[PDB]
Design a protein around this ligand. Structure first.
Ligand code: 5OD
Length: 494
């Protein structure tokens, strides 16, 4: 629960020299692979030298070359830090995190801000405990910590306080006392032991100032601002918080459930998993914080029957399939529906394919699900199979996805008693999280209009607290922004 071992702005050479001059045998760090965008590299020191292990994320999961697949870098690191003797060349041990000092991935670091801007933002958007750290324009190389204190203006009950931070010999201080190795160490220190002014005011550092909430109508401008690197800084800052979602996943780790996971390490949270009324399926309920989703994996051969038990149990009437049955040569989902016009039984569940409708970007399958033994349990389940998603990367234009979800939305709305919408791909976190986050953001705009606030990272973080790894890559993070922008332009044209 730390994640100081990730260095977002480090070359392969610098990582080698940091392990050799400030590390020891066992010291490790992770960095984004500059060789290919979207990849990563685990750099470990061993026997007086540096070994680089490749981690690939094409959009579905983190693939540790020579290792196992994970939903987050945090789980990857924790897995091998606790299972000493799994990563091998001769076992290669992860012992000591080489902590990063870069604050460019901290939610509260706004190097650009000035004095007035910091006060204006903290005044207009901030509440009690809202703080931020910026670089001082007065003293080149120093920083300033701004904090708003008071009660939730124009009365004096609240105020803003500026606390200078001096950077001397690679370490930071507030003018006296202890000196910290980085701004993060300084901040985390005063989040526990807040400063106390001479007259009693406690400079509490509750939450960082929110700068990612925007008005939907003004999405076009925020997109341009994030393009000359902004997306990357904002996305890795979201990744920096993944270590705050280390929730219980005991049920998926039982022996009797191990073979129900397409990837043993990608598991559902206990507190949001779908419990079947034998009870286990790798799926989670996603509740936006009326319409909910079930984010789940692609069916294994031995989980098709459980999959339909879930669909029936939850009264789901729509399935969003976002992957071909095979991609890049490897399987991603077992065909769990019968051929057109055919009827087939999956355990106690019975499925008829009434008719298939081919579209440009997807295939629709009108399915009639029922329970064997009782001829009053029949309901129509509409499977929307999106088939035009590239094996590598993301769509170049979001119109296909948006038209796809627009149709999926209206079907769901036309069924009164409908339960959660089932969305799945390979591991059910990458594309599945992308489709679900876009659907959530689009829902808000369609209801409240373009004059509403939306917050992309906050929405992804809220979804990640219900299933780990939702939305996997920066390409998918950027594509979400583009889909929202495209949808906004449609509304403004009509
Ligand atoms: C410029 C900067 N150094 C990087 C971008 N920026 C921010 C701010 N806030 C979030 C955020 C918002 C809601 C939930 C979560 Cl979990 C997060 Cl992390 C974020 N992802 N980036 C500010 C500082």
């Amino acid at each position: 629960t730390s994640r100081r071992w990730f260095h977002p702005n480090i070359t392969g050479v610098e990582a080698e020299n940091l392990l050799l001059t400030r590390g020891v045998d066992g010291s490790f760090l992770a960095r984004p692979s500059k060789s290919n965008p979207g990849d990563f590299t685990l750099s470990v020191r061993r026997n007086g030298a540096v070994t680089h292990i490749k981690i690939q994320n094409t959009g579905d999961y983190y693939d540790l070359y020579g290792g196992e697949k994970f939903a987050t870098l945090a789980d990857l690191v924790q897995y091998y830090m606790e299972h000493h003797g799994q990563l091998k060349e001769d076992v290669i041990e992860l012992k000591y995190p080489l902590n990063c000092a870069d604050p460019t991935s901290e939610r509260w670091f706004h190097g650009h801000l000035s004095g007035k801007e910091a006060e204006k933002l903290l005044t207009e958007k901030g509440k009690h405990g809202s703080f931020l750290v910026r670089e001082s324009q007065s003293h080149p190389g120093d920083f300033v910590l701004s904090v708003r204190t008071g009660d939730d203006s124009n009365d004096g009950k609240s105020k803003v306080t500026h606390v200078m931070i001096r950077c001397q010999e690679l370490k930071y201080d507030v003018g006296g006392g202890e000196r910290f190795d980085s701004l993060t160490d300084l901040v985390e220190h005063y989040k526990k032991n807040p400063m106390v002014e001479t007259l009693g005011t406690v400079l509490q550092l509750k939450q960082p100032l929110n700068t990612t909430r925007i008005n939907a109508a003004e999405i076009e401008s925020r997109v341009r601002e994030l393009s000359k690197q902004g997306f990357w800084e904002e996305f890795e800052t979201l990744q920096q918080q993944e270590c705050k979602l280390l929730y219980s996943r005991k049920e998926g780790q039982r022996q009797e459930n191990k073979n129900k996971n397409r990837y043993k390490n990608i598991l559902p949270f206990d507190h949001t998993r779908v419990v079947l009324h034998s009870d286990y399926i790798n799926a989670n309920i996603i509740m936006p914080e009326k319409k909910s989703y079930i984010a789940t994996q692609g069916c294994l051969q031995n989980t098709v029957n459980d999959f339909w038990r879930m669909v029936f149990q939850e009264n789901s009437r729509v399935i969003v399939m976002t992957t071909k049955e095979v991609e890049r040569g490897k399987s991603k989902c077992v065909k769990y529906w019968p051929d057109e016009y055919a009827l087939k039984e999956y355990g106690v569940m019975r499925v008829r394919n009434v008719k298939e409708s081919a579209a440009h970007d997807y295939t629709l399958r009108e399915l009639k699900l029922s329970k064997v033994g009782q001829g009053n349990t029949e309901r129509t389940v509409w499977q929307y199979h999106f088939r035009t998603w590239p094996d590598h990367g993301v769509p170049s234009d979001p119109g296909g996805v948006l038209d796809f979800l627009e149709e999926v939305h209206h079907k769901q709305e036309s069924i009164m008693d409908a339960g959660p919408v089932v969305v799945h791909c390979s591991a059910g976190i990458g594309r599945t999280g992308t489709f679900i986050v876009i659907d959530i953001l689009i829902d808000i705009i369609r209801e409240k209009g373009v004059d509403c606030d939306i917050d992309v990272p906050k929405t992804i973080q809220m979804v990640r607290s219900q299933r780990s790894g939702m939305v996997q890559t920066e390409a998918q993070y950027r594509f979400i922004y583009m889909a929202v922008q495209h949808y906004i332009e449609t509304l403004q044209r009509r």
